[PDB]
């Protein structure tokens, strides 16, 4: 039932080792260990995470975040150039911890969150861990 959890981030004031950001239409800054997302109006901006070596499948994804607008989480795998959205979150003025089910059919190497209205609302992500596991069977380490 042991799934295998890969901490991306956590209290860092910098991307994630072996990690490149391929985001668009946004700022990314730090503050007291959250990843900030600036997007700029009308862009639909998007963090985008590109594991530079390997790929994940399946599993889960975990991670807090706070929000002023609806955040699009999606997954992409870079060889086939495909895209899977995983689900919008509405609005949250505090942190809130999400645990998601990936239901992709490829591997992915880029994890999006993106400003799906295109307002410019701002997006304070934390602990972003993948599980191998579903999102029921996660045992936040
Ligand atoms: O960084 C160097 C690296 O870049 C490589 O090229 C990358 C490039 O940098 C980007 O990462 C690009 O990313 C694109 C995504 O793959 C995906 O296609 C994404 O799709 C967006 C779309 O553009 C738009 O934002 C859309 O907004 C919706 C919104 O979500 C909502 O539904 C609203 O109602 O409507 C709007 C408008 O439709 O949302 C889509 C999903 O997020 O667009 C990204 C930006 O273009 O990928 C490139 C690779 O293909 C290479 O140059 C590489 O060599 C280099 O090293």
Same mark, same amino acid.
């Given at each position: %039932? /042991?799934?295998?959890?890969?901490?991306? $981030?956590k209290? &860092?004031?910098?991307?994630?080792? *072996?990690?490149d950001?391929?985001?668009?239409?946004?700022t990314?800054?730090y503050?007291?260990?959250?990843?900030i997302?600036?997007?700029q109006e009308?862009?639909?901006? &998007? %963090?985008? +995470?590109? #594991?530079?070596?390997?790929? $994940? #499948?399946?599993?889960?994804? /975990?991670?807090?975040?706070?929000?002023?607008?609806?955040?699009?989480?999606?997954?992409?795998?870079?060889?086939?150039?495909?895209k899977?959205? %995983?689900?919008?979150?509405?609005?949250?003025?505090?942190?809130?911890?999400?645990? +998601?089910?990936?239901? $992709?059919?490829?591997?992915?190497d880029?994890?999006?969150?993106?400003? &799906?209205?295109?307002? *410019?609302? #701002?997006?304070?992500?934390?602990?972003? %861990?993948?599980?191998? *596991?579903?999102?029921?069977?996660?045992?936040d380490?």
């Open positions: %039932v /042991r799934a295998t959890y890969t901490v991306i $981030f209290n &860092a004031s910098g991307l994630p080792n *072996g990690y950001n391929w985001g668009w239409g946004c990314l800054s503050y007291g260990g959250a990843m997302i600036n997007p009308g862009k639909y901006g &998007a %963090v985008s +995470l590109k #594991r530079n070596s390997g790929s $994940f #499948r399946g599993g889960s994804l /975990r991670f807090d975040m706070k929000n002023e607008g609806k955040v699009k989480i999606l997954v992409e795998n870079s060889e086939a150039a495909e899977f959205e %995983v689900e919008t979150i509405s609005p949250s003025d505090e942190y809130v911890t999400y645990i +998601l089910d990936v239901d $992709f059919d490829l591997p992915f880029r994890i999006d969150f993106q400003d &799906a209205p295109g307002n *410019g609302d #701002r997006i304070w992500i934390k602990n972003l %861990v993948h599980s191998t *596991g579903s999102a029921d069977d996660f045992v380490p």
